[PDB]
Fold:
Amino acid sequence: SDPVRQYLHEIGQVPLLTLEEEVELARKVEEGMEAIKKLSEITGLDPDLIREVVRAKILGSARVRHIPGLKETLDPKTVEEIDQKLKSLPKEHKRYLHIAREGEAARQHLIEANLRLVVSIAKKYTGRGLSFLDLIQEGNQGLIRAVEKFEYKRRFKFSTYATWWIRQAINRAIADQARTIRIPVHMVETINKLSRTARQLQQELGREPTYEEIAEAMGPGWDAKRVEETLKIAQEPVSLETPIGDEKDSFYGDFIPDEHLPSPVDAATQSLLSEELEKALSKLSEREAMVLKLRKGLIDGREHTLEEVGAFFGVTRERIRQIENKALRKLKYHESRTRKLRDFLD
Amino acid sequence: AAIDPEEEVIAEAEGVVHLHEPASILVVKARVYPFEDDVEVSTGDRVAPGDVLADGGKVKSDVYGRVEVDLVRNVVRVVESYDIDARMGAEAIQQLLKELDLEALEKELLEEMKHPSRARRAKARKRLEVVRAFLDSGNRPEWMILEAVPVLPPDLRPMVQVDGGRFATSDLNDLYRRLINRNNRLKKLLAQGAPEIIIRNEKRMLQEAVD
Amino acid sequence: DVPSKIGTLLDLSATELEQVLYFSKYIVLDPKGAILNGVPVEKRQLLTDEEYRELRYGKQETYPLPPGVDALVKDGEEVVKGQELAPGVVSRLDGVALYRFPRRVRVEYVKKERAGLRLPLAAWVEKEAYKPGEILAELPEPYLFRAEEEGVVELKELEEGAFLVLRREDEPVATYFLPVGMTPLVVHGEIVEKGQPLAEAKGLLRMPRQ
DNA sequence: GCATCCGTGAGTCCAGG
DNA sequence: TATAATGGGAGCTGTCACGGATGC
Ligand SMILES: [Mg+2]
Structure:
């Protein structure tokens, strides 16, 4: 019922590796990687396509799916075709097919063996934005990189090299998802550095630091203004459903207006403006009203150049500019008289 | 063989080899089949009795199982195992929902409705209510399993800058984000061919995110 | 939503639909002639992880060998339930045993050589070859096998039985074979002239087992 | 046939903070 | 990028009462 207890059980199924069993699975993995390289040398097919085919038949038909790097869609038809053209090899070549299969199975068994290291490492990363189980699955991506990159020949135990890629993976996830508004990795590291700096400064000052103390202890290039802006960028969003009162009647969204959709006052004012603009445009002849309705864009939404208004009216650009002048002047006179439009200038 | 050549073991003269004091011993319910010529199945292939293992057709399969081509010992090992299709989760259940022929269940349960015991009548009526709801409706039972989870339009779950410049947001945003992260991580653990246990855990966690 | 609509249609109790949906039990869609505990696999039957892994990948088990103790059973060799796999390991299933990381590799090197012995005709048992352990000769009284070359002694000792090689100057000059029942009287690297005692044979001398 | 466990519901509006 | 590291931690304690689905 409790997902992490269930997953701790599934993990305690696979027993841990003896130094021999670990070195053996490691070695088989390295040699199967080698064998896929050799099988590409032999067949001239793409090493990644080769790897995905060997992997397909290892895991089973339960899982075959299109791979993004692969230039070909990986369905049972084409994996049967390529598995057949692989089985059509000489003994000393088809031997590399058997090698790759064994290497894939060693890979799965070594991963599933070291699945508990991931848990023991991610338990120290909770309360940092991400769920325990989210943290374990990122540690599992770390375990996968580490299996595919491990060199038994260096004589090091597996745990030592895996722990690096596991820590790497968990930290990249924490820095990549824990924020609703996502902030690049380098910037998150800068923010955290600034955190720890201010904490040192306060733990020695007996009080919080100002922007200036932090801009000093942070180093050159950093002025108080920059500390300020970096903080303003780090400011996480807050929930609309965060309550204000003991009762559930009170949310925080219930106080935020909507400044996008216009108010009925606003819309009505635009309507009265449109109508009064029409009323004062009609005192112009339809040519000068039309020249202005084009040169500003109250019709069709866009304003025209003088060449367009003159090639529409069949008149020179000086003449259409001139009847625009006189249209504007007659509108200014009508406005000095009736004063019907002043109230809309705000 | 060994890490560095100067520790390898080479045979100085002709002799047979004997292996004493092994680290541990592994009993496997399997079937052995030696070979001398070219072998025609690789490790990972599943084979039923009557299948061609090695040497052009001479040595063949006795038992139901899965192929382990031991090259050191020059023998094909077939480990007793069926090709059983047993699944987990909503992909399985969506299958079973697709495979439900409704009218045949309507018939089964109408027959059931004649039963003397009041209990079987009650349960077959209850079930028939669902079957006939889906029938009269036009609704495919598998629709109760989501493949494409829809996204509510942004304005009804907003990211709004309040007066102070700070941001308010809705909880549906953090829920959807959880969903996209677990879905993307799943797609990437699939492409990279991750083990079973891990894909199971990602699948479960993804269910709970949709929940 | 009780009573589950999905759980109603497919005749699955809430407990089971949870177990399949939240990944605690497998549900079968095509048994493919699978079997378990003798009963064959019926479609839509619910299987735990142990059960499904058994049917799908095969029962197996590894048992550890304490250090220094060898195997009672051989590699590749079929074993039965209950059969002890080592002086402290008893196997819980049947099938083929397999070795995991042998500690000691013993190579038996074959040697085909030519060696000479001298015996009183009375005691010899004439045969065209001599099987291992087969009697070679029966002597009535202690008889001193004697050197037939001058040289330095290379005394190579087997489990039972011995090889004396005399070598004048590095180059070998004689290879004498001393079978079971004949004690050498010389030490490695000894100098012997012709006719001095190499070995005393008493009673019967038979071929060694090796 | 009875307990037994499950989920679901439990008055209106108004102010603050 | 390489000593080696291999199964988590809370829980939260004083409603009340129904209906309706699930086990001896
Ligand atoms: Mg500074």
In short: Residues 4-5, 7-9, 11-12, 16-17, 113-121, 123, 126, 132, 145-146, 149-151, 154-157, 159-165, 168 of chain A lie near DNA strand E (CB under 10 Å from a C1'). Residues 1-179 of chain A form a domain with the Four Helix Bundle (Hemerythrin (Met), subunit A) fold (CATH 1.20.120.1810). Residues 36 and 51 of chain A are 7 Å apart (CA to CA). Chain A touches chain B through 60 residues (CB under 8 Å).
